[PDB]
Amino acid sequence: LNGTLMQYFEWYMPNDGQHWKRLQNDSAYLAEHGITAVWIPPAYKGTSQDDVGYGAYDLYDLGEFHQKGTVRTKYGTKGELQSAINSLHSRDINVYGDVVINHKGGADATEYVTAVEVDPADRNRVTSGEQRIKAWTHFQFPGRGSTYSDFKWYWYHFDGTDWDESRKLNRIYKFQGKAWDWEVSNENGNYDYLMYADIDYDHPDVTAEIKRWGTWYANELQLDGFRLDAVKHIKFSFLRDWVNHVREKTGKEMFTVAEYWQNDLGALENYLNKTNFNHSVFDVPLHYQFHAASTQGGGYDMRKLLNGTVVSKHPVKAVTFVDNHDTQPGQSLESTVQTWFKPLAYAFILTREAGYPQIFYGDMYGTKGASQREIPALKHKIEPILKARKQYAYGAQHDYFDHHNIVGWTREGDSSVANSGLAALITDGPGGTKRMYVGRQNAGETWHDITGNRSDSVVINAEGWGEFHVNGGSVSIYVQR
């Protein structure tokens, strides 16, 4: 009954075109270990074969047309992806497609465009007179032609770009007659501009087309939902309308989670309010608390984990996570949760009652960057925690955040899941004990640490309490033998 998401990629995976086939082959393992949905990387053609997918050259080329030096995307062909989805669906695993609609990269040709420079620290401030630039804005899709969509893109579908090809210069340019979209993040004055050619969501043909593409994408891949990329750079009312639109056209629930990247609960709450709470967000503040705890050597106050997070205020709209493709080593938002702490963080997201937790491919299987700081494969340490969630993390919760280091929580179990109930402890410093209440209904049961970190049994007393142990900088999750 508990649902668990997996982000099924990391940044540095090899460009061998076998990822979709790998996903197909992993479907039995995923289903067996309690994964109920996967977020797949962007499935459409990027600026090159080795694009992770955020380039977003051609949204209608799912590895089907010979464009940018390749038919396949990094991850494989359309047919291979459709087969992977078919295998996942046969095991009741839902699939969330990544939606990259902030920008378009890798335009087929430049156009001459009149523009002004803007201050990268305050994009509302103009820093030049008008000048003629060569911007990468013409999309003709020569390998695809009009198959699926005859929509062509031109400079006037965008607000701006970061590159003038004529002078060969990297600045933020705003096109003549354009205005940055609102509402977006107010960072850098207005954070509409991020990268490549920035889509103009004031343009009514653009809003219609991105909506029409959304339905097409959902149909083509039989998606159950979406992950929205870079949403702090995209007109909030448009994202609301897009989600409603696709739900209306498909007639499906289409669970959606947006990546609004800001370590700030208030900003996230503003985004939720302005999108009418129609979709979830990733719990970025919780990720930064995990990173903080993992880097402070026991000095972190573990009590802080209960506050300042999306999951603490809006649990039904929080997708909780430990690390992702932006926070992994070497990447643009690097804030990796250190390996020693990582299982403790997974206990926090997987065994507590609030939030929709997500497991990271890079944590399960390791990351394949070129550094000596890559995340090691932690599958074996995460699996017992996944099993705790799947089989034991049910029923009423009791919190014990009553200590700088050793914090814990229990779950009483639910009569709908036989033998359910658990008692979790984590500590960023010295180990020790904590007595916790697991429910009088569990009186006299013998519980053991499903992680194997502690080998002692705990017998629950008549009053429903057990004396639970945890090792230094460790995690233990006791459940009925």
Ligand SMILES: [Ca+2]
């Ligand atoms: Ca934008």
Ligand SMILES: [Ca+2]
């Ligand atoms: Ca605009």
Ligand code: NA
């Ligand atoms: Na824009």
Ligand code: NA
């Ligand atoms: Na601490």
